[PDB]
Design a protein around this nucleic acid. Structure first.
Lengths: 167, 350, 493, 59, 64, 171, 128, 33
RNA sequence: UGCGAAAGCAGUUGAAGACAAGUGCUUGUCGUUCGUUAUAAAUGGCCU
C-alpha cells in the first residue's frame, strides 16, 4: 500500500577540502553564459540565468550509472563539453570516475563512463586551457601531499592516460 | 500604408517571402509560418536577408519555385532593370540572373517546371529555361498595348496558352502567337489573375471590391464575388472549394463554394485581428490549403507573425485577440513588485 | 544585499485607557471660542446647505454665525417676546421661528429684513417649529396648547392637520426619515406619540412610555428613534415598538440630542447628547450606543449641535449653556520660453508600450542617534541619547540598542565626571519609570564597576549616587508595597 | 538658439551649400542631428518634437 | 564584499549579504558576474551554504 | 516622411541615433521615453517604446560590441546620478549604472556621456567603455558592461566637450 | 514548508524544490551589521516553535531572546509570542500582535497547539 | 502532509515522502542558420 | 562535560613531541600526537 520515495533535493555540493582556497565553488556557467550548472549532494541542477528558474535537473537515482557511482564519492569538477569528442558536460569525481552527461534534453541511460587509473590517489582538481588537461591528486603530520599529472585521451584504446609532471 | 511592399507564400504554405525597405535599400527575407517544425523543434526567427546593393534597384515580382519539384528551394525575383534573379534562400545569395536584352522593368512572371515566362514594360513576352539558363524566344503580340499580369493556363505538362491582362483580359496561343479570346475586364488595371480550375479563372483590379469569375472556353462571366473593401491578395483552396481575399482595410474575407442572386455573391466568413488594448492589426497576406487558414500580420514594425486557424469551425464574424505591448509594467525576474532584490531577506518591522 | 533595517522604537506592553481611534478624531475639535449672550441659548440649528451656517436662539433674537468666520453675519431682532426656534428648511432658503406670544414667523434665510409669512399658531407660547424634511410646503408647530398643528406655507389661515392627545406640554417634534406620513411628538407626560398624517389623524397610532418628561425626540434611522428625557436617553424601534437600548450615564437631565451620519470620522455615525450637568457626550450607534468621548462646560448645557454630514469645510461642535454662553469647537480642514524648452516632465507614459520604474521610495530621515549606531559610533550615540528635548521613549531605545549590540562597556570607556553626569541625571529620573527601571540598573551597574576609582576623587559624582541611592530605596518601597496589595488581593479571590 | 540654423559644409572645400536649406525648409529649433551609417539619410530633431528625414541622393 | 580598486587603493562595498563569504570569484570574459559562497554561520548544527551569482553591472543577485 | 509622424513625441528631441547595422532610429527627450522607429522613408513605423519614470533623457545612443556582433545595447542618461543600459519583447532587460567606486564627488550627473571601444593590448581583448564629464576638468571612464571605474582624465579649466579618435597600429 | 532558522523562517517549496522566501521574525542584530570578534559571541533571538492555525490565515511563533553577558540582567531570558497574518496572494507575513513574557516572567512556553476548526473557526490556540 | 502522504526530513537535507522530404530538410537547415 | 527547570546539582580542565626567544637551563607557542563525558590588540566598522 505505502511506498517510500525521495522527492526534494539537498545541500549544494562543495569542494570539502581544507587546503584548497578559491576553488571551493564547483558550479560552472555555460559557454554561452545562459545557464548555470550546480552540483548537489544528490543531483545536478541546471538553472537559466535569464529567467532564474531550474530548467533541468539530473537526478542520480533516475540514472543507473549515477545511482551506482554516487549512491562516499563527490564531484571534484565539471568541465563544459566532452573531452573525448553542444550541451555536454564532463564530471570528474574524487575517486576518478569520468562521466559525460548531457543537459538540455533527455538524459541517456548509457553515458560515456570512463575511469582514470589512480594508485592510492584521491583526485582533487582538474583544469584545462586549450585541449590540454592536467589533474591534481592527493596522496599521504596531518598535512597532505599533492601530485600533478597530465591527462590525455587516446582514441585507439579509449582510455585516460596519466603522466607525472610535478609533486 | 504597409511596410511590406510584397509578399508571397510558397506553394506548400509553410514559408513566406516578403520584401521590405531598410533605409533606402530593399531587402528580401524568408520566414517560416508554422509555429513548430514536424520534428517538434520550435521555430525561430530568420535574421538573414538579401540586400539589394543599389537604392534604385527594386523588386517588382516574387515567385516561389516549388519546393518539392527542385532539390534546392528557390524564389524567382523580377526587378526593374529588366532582369530576373534566381535566389537560393539557404545560401542567401543570388545563384543566377536571367537578363533580357532590353532594360524595361518586369511586370509579371510565372512558372511551370522548367518553363519561365515574363513580360516587360514594353509589352514583350519572353521565355526562359531554368535548367538551361537561356532565353528561348521573345515576341510582341499586337493589340496588347499594356500588360500588368501574366498567368499560364495549367494544361497538361506543357504550356499551350497564356492569360494576360492590362485592363481587359486576353488569352493567347504561344505557337500561333495571337490572341484567342478576350474577356471584358475591369476599369482599373488588373491586379490578380489566378486560375481557380479549368475553364474558370478569377480576376481582380486595383482599388476594386469586385472579382470576376470568367469561363475560359465560353468567355462569359460566371459570377462576381464582392468583398467589403478593396482587395489586395487572393488565395484559392483545392479546386474552387474556398477563396480567401485580403481586403485593404486589414480584414480577411472567405468565400465558401463560390462556383456553386447567383450572379453576385458576398463573402460568407470574415476574420479580423484586434489587440487586447483595442488597436486593430491589419492582415497583409493569408494562405488557405484544405481546412486550415494561415493569417499573417506585422508586429513591431516589419516583423511578420502568423497564426493557423481552422476556418470551418470559425463563426461568420470572428476577431482574433492578440497580446501586444501597451502600458506594460516592466517586471524583471530578479526583482519583486516593489523592486526589492529576490535574494534579499525580508526585514523585521513591528 | 538587503537594505539596512530601521531601528525599531521601544514599545512596552499596553497600559489601561489607551487612546482610541474615536477619541483621536474628537480631540481635534480644539479651537475653543466662548461667546456670551444676553439670556440662555435655547436652540441651535445648522443650515442643511453650503456654507452650513448655524442659527442660535437666545432671548428675543436669532443670530446666524458664519462657519468659516465663526462670527455673526445675520441677526433677527424683529421678535418682541422670547424666541424658541430657528430651524431651516431642507432647501435652506427659509428659517422659521416661534415666539412666546404664539406667533410663528418664517423669514428668508440671509435676508432678515423680509418676512415671507407670519402665522398665529395659538395664543399660548410656541416652543417648537420645524419644517417637514420630506415635504417643503408643510410646516409643523407645537405649542403649550398641547396641540401640534401641521401648517402649510401656501395656506396660512388654517392648519392642514391638528394633532392632539397630549396631556402636557409638547416641546419635541420629529419627522421619521423615509416615512413622510409619520410624525412623532414627545410631551412632558413621558409618552412619545406617533401620528399618521395620511389618515384622519388627531389620534396617535400608538404611544411609547419614557416614564420621565421627554426633553427631545430624534430619529436616528428610518426604523429607530432615540428619545432623551429625565436622566437617560432610550432608543426605540418603531417596527417592534420596544426600547432596544438605554444609557443613563448622565447625572442631570439630558436636554438636547443630535445625530450625524456618513461623515469622515472613523465612526460612521455619532450621537451627541447634552446633559444639563455641563456634559455633552458622544455615543456610537454601531456599538450598542456606548460612550466614546465627552466635553465639560462651565454650566448646564441646554443645546448642542454638530455640523451636517456634508459640511465641506471646517467642522463645528456647538454647545449652548443656560448662562447665555455659546461654546464653539472647530476641527479645521516660469516664462513660456522656459516651459517649452523643458516640456516633457508632465508625461507619465500613458501611450507607451513599456513603462519601467526603478526609483526607490523616499525613506524617512534618520535621527542623529540612529546614524551614529549605523556608523558604529557607540560613544557618540550614547551622547545623543541625553540631549535637551529628547523623547523619553526615544532615549530608551538607544540604550536598549547599545545593550542589544553588546556595546555597554565600550560606550563608557572614554568618559570622566564631566561627561558621565548626563547619563546619571537621566538615570536619576529613569529609575522611577517601570519601563526604564531595569535598563537603568544595567547601565548604573557597569558605570560603578568601571569607574570606582574616579568616584572617590570626584565630589560631584558622589552626590549623584547619594540621591540615586535615595531614589532606588524609594522604588524598593513602592515595589514591596505593590507586592503587599497583591497578597491581600489574592486573599479576596 | 534660433530657428533654421543648420548648415551643411562640403569637405575639403569648406564651402557652405547654397541651395539647401532654404527659407521654406522646416527645421525649427534644431536640437538633434544624425547621419545614417549608410544610405545618406539625415535626421533632424527640433524643439517641437518632430524628427524630419532627408535623403542625400549622392549616396 | 569589498572590491578593492588597487589603482587608487579605494574600495566599493556590497554589505548585508546573507552570510559570511567563504569564496569569491569573477566569472566572465569581461567580468560580467561575481560568484559567491555564503555560509550562514548562525546555524551551528550544520553548514548552510548558499551560492550567489551577482550581476557586476548593478550588483544585484542574478541567481541565488 | 517624418520619423516621428507615426507616434509623436511630447517633448523636444534631445538626442538621435541610428543603429550601426539595422535600419532603426532612436529618439529621446525630457518626456522620459525612448522611442525606436523603423526608418524606411515612406512609413517609418514605431518598433518599440520605453518610458523611464523620473529619468529625463539628455543623451542616448546605440552600442554594438566590436567583437561580438550579436551584442546590441542602448545607453541613456540625464541630469541624474545614474545611467540606464538596455540589452537587445515581453519585457525589457534594463540595468542601472549608479556606482563610481570612490569618485562620486567628481561626477554629479551622467547627462554628458559617450561610448567607445577600448582594446586591452596586454591581452588583445576589446571591450566598450563609457566616458563621462566630471566637475572640474574630469573625464571618468567606466567599463560598459561591468560598470567598473577604469581610469580618469583631468584637464585644466571647465571641461566643455570631448571626442574620441582611433589610430590603428597593426593587424 | 517552513523551517525555523535561527531568528528567521525559511519558506521552501518542496514541489518545485526551491526556496520561496527568507523572513526575519524577531528583533536583534540580524542583518543590521556583520558580527566580528567579541560581537560574534552574541546570540540572536531563537525561534523555538512555529505553528499555523487550521485555516492557515494565522501564524503563531514563539521566541526566546537571550541577554548579553556581563550585565545584571544577564540571566533573565525573555519569552515572546507573536501572531502574524498574510493574504494568500502576498508572500510576507505581517506581525499583528506581540505578547511579551506570556505566562509570566522567565517561564517558557513548552507547547503550542492551534485550535480545531470547531472552536472560533480555528482562530485560537493553546499554550502550555 | 494534509493529503494522505507523509513527508520526512533526512539530515542530508533530503525530503522524502511515504504515502499510498525536401521541406523537412529545409526546416532543419533554416533552424541551423 | 553529564542531568535538569530557567534555578541549580555533580565533575573536569592531563601527558608526550617539535619549534621560537632569553640565558645544558628558563619561558611562550603549535594548519603535531595520545588520553578524559569534558582576555583581545597590524589605526583595522557595512555602497550608490
Amino acid at each position: 500500500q505505502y511506498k517510500l520515495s525521495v522527492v526534494s533535493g539537498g545541500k549544494p555540493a562543495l569542494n570539502n577540502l581544507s587546503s584548497v582556497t578559491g576553488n571551493k565553488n564547483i558550479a560552472r556557467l555555460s559557454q554561452d553564459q545562459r545557464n548555470y550548472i550546480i552540483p548537489f549532494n544528490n543531483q545536478i541542477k541546471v538553472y537559466s540565468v535569464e529567467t532564474r528558474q531550474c530548467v533541468k535537473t539530473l537526478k542520480f537515482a533516475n540514472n543507473s550509472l549515477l545511482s551506482g557511482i554516487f549512491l562516499n564519492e563527490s564531484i571534484v569538477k565539471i568541465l563544459l563539453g566532452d573531452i573525448t569528442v553542444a550541451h555536454l558536460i564532463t564530471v570528474f569525481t574524487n575517486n576518478g570516475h569520468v562521466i559525460v552527461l548531457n543537459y538540455k534534453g533527455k538524459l541517456v541511460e548509457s553515458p560515456k563512463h570512463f575511469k582514470i587509473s589512480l594508485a592510492d590517489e584521491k583526485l582533487a582538481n582538474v583544469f584545462h586551457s586549450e585541449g590540454n588537461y592536467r589533474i591534481l591528486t592527493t596522496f599521504k603530520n596531518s598535512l597532505q601531499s599533492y601530485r600533478l599529472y597530465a591527462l590525455t585521451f587516446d582514441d585507439a584504446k579509449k582510455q585516460f592516460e596519466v603522466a607525472h609532471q610535478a609533486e | 500604408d504597409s511596410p511590406v511592399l510584397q509578399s508571397a507564400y510558397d506553394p506548400s504554405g509553410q514559408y513566406l517571402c516578403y520584401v521590405t525597405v531598410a533605409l533606402d535599400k530593399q531587402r528580401v527575407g524568408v520566414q517560416p509560418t508554422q509555429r513548430a517544425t514536424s520534428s517538434g523543434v520550435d521555430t525561430v526567427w530568420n535574421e538573414n536577408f538579401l540586400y539589394l546593393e543599389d537604392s534604385k534597384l527594386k523588386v517588382t515580382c516574387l515567385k516561389w519555385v516549388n519546393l518539392a519539384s527542385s532539390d534546392t528551394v528557390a524564389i524567382i525575383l523580377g526587378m526593374n532593370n529588366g532582369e530576373i534573379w534566381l535566389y537560393s534562400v539557404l545560401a542567401n545569395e543570388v545563384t543566377y540572373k536571367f537578363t533580357t536584352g532590353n532594360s524595361y522593368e518586369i511586370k509579371d512572371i510565372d512558372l511551370m517546371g522548367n518553363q519561365l515566362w515574363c513580360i516587360d514594360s514594353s509589352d514583350a513576352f519572353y521565355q526562359f529555361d531554368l535548367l538551361q539558363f537561356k532565353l528561348l524566344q521573345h515576341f510582341r503580340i499586337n493589340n496588347c498595348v499594356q500588360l500588368n499580369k501574366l498567368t499560364i493556363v495549367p494544361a497538361g505538362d506543357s504550356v499551350a496558352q497564356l492569360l494576360v491582362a492590362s485592363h481587359s483580359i486576353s488569352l493567347i496561343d504561344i505557337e500561333e502567337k495571337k490572341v484567342v479570346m478576350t474577356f471584358p475586364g475591369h476599369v482599373s488595371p488588373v491586379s490578380t489573375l489566378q486560375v481557380i480550375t479549368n475553364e474558370f479563372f478569377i480576376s481582380g483590379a486595383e482599388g476594386d471590391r469586385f472579382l470576376n469569375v470568367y469561363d475560359i472556353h465560353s468567355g462569359m462571366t460566371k459570377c462576381v464575388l464582392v468583398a467589403e473593401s478593396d482587395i489586395k491578395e487572393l488565395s484559392h483552396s483545392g479546386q474552387a472549394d474556398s477563396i480567401a481575399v485580403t481586403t485593404e482595410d486589414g480584414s480577411l474575407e472567405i468565400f465558401v463554394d463560390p462556383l456553386v442572386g447567383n450572379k453576385s455573391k458576398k463573402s460568407s466568413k470574415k476574420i479580423q485581428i484586434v489587440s487586447k488594448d483595442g488597436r486593430k492589426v491589419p492582415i497583409y497576406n493569408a494562405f488557405i490549403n484544405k481546412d486550415l487558414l494561415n493569417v499573417s500580420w506585422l508586429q513591431n514594425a516589419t516583423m511578420p507573425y502568423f497564426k493557423n486557424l481552422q476556418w470551418r469551425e470559425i463563426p461568420n464574424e470572428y476577431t482574433v485577440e492578440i497580446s501586444l505591448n501597451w502600458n506594460n509594467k516592466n517586471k524583471s525576474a530578479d526583482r519583486d513588485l516593489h523592486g526589492k532584490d529576490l535574494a534579499s531577506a525580508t526585514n523585521y518591522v513591528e | 544585499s538587503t537594505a539596512r533595517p530601521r531601528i525599531i522604537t521601544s514599545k512596552a506592553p499596553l497600559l489601561p485607557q489607551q487612546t482610541t481611534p474615536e477619541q483621536r478624531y474628537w480631540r481635534q475639535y480644539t479651537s475653543a471660542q466662548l461667546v456670551k449672550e444676553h439670556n440662555s441659548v435655547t436652540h441651535i440649528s445648522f443650515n442643511p446647505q453650503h456654507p452650513h451656517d448655524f442659527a442660535v436662539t437666545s432671548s428675543t433674537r436669532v443670530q446666524i454665525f458664519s462657519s468659516r468666520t465663526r462670527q455673526v453675519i445675520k441677526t433677527f431682532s424683529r421678535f418682541k417676546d422670547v424666541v424658541y426656534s430657528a430651524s431651516f428648511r431642507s432647501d435652506g432658503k427659509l428659517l422659521c421661528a416661534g415666539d412666546a406670544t404664539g406667533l410663528v414667523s418664517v423669514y428668508d434665510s440671509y435676508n432678515p429684513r423680509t418676512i415671507l409669512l407670519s402665522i398665529n399658531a395659538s395664543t399660548h407660547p410656541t416652543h417648537v417649529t420645524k419644517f417637514h424634511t420630506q415635504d417643503n410646503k408643510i410646516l409643523a408647530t407645537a405649542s403649550d396648547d398641547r396641540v401640534t398643528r401641521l401648517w402649510d406655507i401656501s395656506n396660512a389661515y388654517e392648519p392642514q392637520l391638528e394633532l392632539t392627545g397630549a396631556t402636557d406640554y409638547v416641546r419635541t417634534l420629529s419627522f421619521i426619515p423615509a416615512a413622510p406620513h409619520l410624525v412623532a411628538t414627545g410631551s412632558y407626560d413621558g409618552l412619545i406619540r406617533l401620528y399618521d398624517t395620511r389618515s384622519s389623524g388627531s389620534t396617535p397610532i400608538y404611544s411609547l412610555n419614557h416614564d420621565q418628561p421627554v426633553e427631545n425626540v430624534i430619529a436616528v434611522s428610518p426604523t429607530q428613534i432615540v428619545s432623551c428625557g429625565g436622566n437617560n436617553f432610550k432608543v426605540w424601534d418603531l417596527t417592534s415598538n420596544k426600547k432596544l437600548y438605554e444609557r443613563g450615564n448622565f447625572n442631570k437631565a439630558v436636554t438636547c440630542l443630535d445625530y450625524v451620519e456618513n461623515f469622515d470620522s472613523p465612526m460612521q455615525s455619532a450621537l451627541i447628547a447634552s446633559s444639563l450637568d455641563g456634559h455633552v457626550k458622544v455615543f456610537d450607534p454601531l456599538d450598542n450606543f456606548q460612550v466614546k468621548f465627552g466635553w465639560k462646560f462651565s454650566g448646564p448645557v441646554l443645546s448642542c449641535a454638530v455640523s451636517p454630514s456634508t459640511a465641506q469645510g471646517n467642522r463645528h461642535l456647538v454647545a449652548g449653556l443656560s448662562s447665555g454662553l455659546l461654546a464653539i469647537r472647530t476641527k479645521k480642514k516660469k516664462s513660456n520660453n522656459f516651459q517649452r524648452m523643458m516640456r516633457g516632465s508632465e508625461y507619465q507614459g500613458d501611450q507607451e508600450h513599456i513603462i519601467h520604474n526603478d526609483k526607490v521610495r523616499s525613506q524617512r530621515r534618520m535621527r542623529a542617534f540612529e546614524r551614529n549606531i549605523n556608523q558604529f559610533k557607540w560613544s557618540e550615540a550614547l551622547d545623543n541619547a541625553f540631549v535637551p528635548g529628547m523623547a523619553k521613549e526615544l532615549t530608551l531605545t538607544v540604550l536598549q540598542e547599545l545593550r542589544k549590540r553588546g556595546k555597554v562597556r565600550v560606550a563608557l570607556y572614554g568618559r570622566d565626571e564631566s561627561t558621565l553626569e548626563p547619563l546619571l541625571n537621566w538615570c536619576l529620573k529613569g529609575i522611577e519609570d517601570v519601563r526604564s527601571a531595569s535598563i537603568v540598573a544595567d547601565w548604573v551597574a557597569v558605570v560603578l564597576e568601571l569607574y570606582g576609582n574616579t568616584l572617590e576623587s570626584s565630589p560631584v559624582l558622589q552626590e549623584l549616587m547619594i540621591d540615586l541611592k535615595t531614589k532606588v530605596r524609594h522604588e524598593i518601597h513602592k515595589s514591596k508595597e505593590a507586592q503587599r496589595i497583591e497578597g491581600m488581593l489574592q486573599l479576596l479571590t | 538658439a534660433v530657428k533654421d540654423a543648420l548648415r551643411l559644409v562640403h569637405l575639403p572645400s569648406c564651402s557652405v551649400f547654397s541651395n539647401w536649406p532654404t527659407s521654406g525648409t522646416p527645421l525649427g529649433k534644431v536640437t538633434s542631428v544624425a547621419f545614417s551609417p549608410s544610405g545618406g539619410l539625415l535626421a533632424v530633431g527640433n524643439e517641437q518634437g518632430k524628427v524630419r528625414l532627408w535623403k542625400l541622393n549622392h549616396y | 564584499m569589498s572590491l578593492w580598486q588597487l589603482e587608487t587603493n579605494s574600495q566599493q562595498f556590497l554589505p548585508r549579504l546573507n552570510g559570511i563569504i567563504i569564496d569569491c570569484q569573477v566569472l566572465g570574459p569581461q567580468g560580467n558576474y561575481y560568484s559567491l559562497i555564503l555560509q550562514m554561520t548562525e546555524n551551528n548544527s550544520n553548514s548552510d551554504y548558499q551560492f550567489l551569482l551577482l550581476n557586476a553591472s548593478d550588483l544585484t543577485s542574478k541567481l541565488s | 516622411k517624418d520619423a516621428n509622424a507615426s507616434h509623436p513625441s511630447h517633448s523636444a528631441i534631445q538626442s538621435l541615433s541610428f543603429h550601426p547595422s539595422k535600419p532603426l532610429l532612436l529618439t529621446g527627450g525630457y518626456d522620459k521615453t525612448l522611442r525606436i522607429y523603423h526608418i524606411d522613408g515612406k512609413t517609418n513605423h514605431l518598433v518599440t517604446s520605453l518610458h523611464l519614470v523620473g529619468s529625463p533623457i539628455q543623451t542616448c545612443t546605440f552600442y554594438t560590441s566590436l567583437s561580438n556582433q550579436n551584442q546590441q545595447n542602448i545607453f541613456t542618461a540625464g541630469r541624474r546620478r545614474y545611467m540606464h543600459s538596455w540589452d537587445l519583447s515581453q519585457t525589457a532587460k534594463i540595468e542601472k549604472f549608479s556606482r563610481l567606486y570612490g569618485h562620486e564627488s567628481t561626477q554629479r550627473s551622467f547627462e554628458n556621456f559617450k561610448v567607445a571601444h577600448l582594446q586591452n593590448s596586454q591581452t588583445n581583448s576589446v571591450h566598450g567603455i563609457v566616458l563621462l564629464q566630471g566637475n572640474n576638468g574630469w573625464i571618468n571612464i567606466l567599463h560598459s558592461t561591468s560598470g567598473l571605474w577604469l581610469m580618469g582624465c583631468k584637464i585644466e579649466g571647465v571641461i566643455t566637450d570631448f571626442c574620441i579618435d582611433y589610430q590603428p597600429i597593426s593587424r | 514548508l517552513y523551517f525555523p532558522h535561527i531568528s528567521a523562517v525559511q519558506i521552501f517549496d518542496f514541489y518545485k524544490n526551491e526556496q520561496v522566501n527568507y523572513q526575519y521574525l524577531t528583533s536583534g542584530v540580524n542583518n543590521s551589521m556583520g558580527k566580528v570578534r567579541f560581537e560574534l559571541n552574541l546570540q540572536d533571538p531563537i525561534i523555538t516553535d512555529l505553528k499555523f492555525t487550521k485555516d492557515g490565515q494565522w501564524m503563531i511563533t514563539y521566541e526566546i531572546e537571550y541577554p548579553p553577558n556581563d550585565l545584571l540582567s544577564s540571566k533573565d531570558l525573555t519569552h515572546i509570542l507573536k501572531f502574524w497574518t498574510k493574504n494568500d496572494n502576498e508572500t510576507n507575513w505581517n506581525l499583528k500582535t506581540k505578547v511579551i513574557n506570556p505566562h509570566g516572567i522567565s517561564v517558557p512556553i513548552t507547547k503550542i497547539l492551534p485550535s480545531p476548526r470547531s472552536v472560533n473557526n480555528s482562530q485560537g490556540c493553546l499554550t502550555a | 502532509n494534509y493529503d494522505t502522504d507523509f513527508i520526512f526530513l533526512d539530515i542530508e537535507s533530503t525530503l522524502g515522502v511515504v504515502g499510498t522530404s525536401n521541406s523537412d530538410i529545409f526546416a532543419e537547415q533554416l533552424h541551423k542558420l
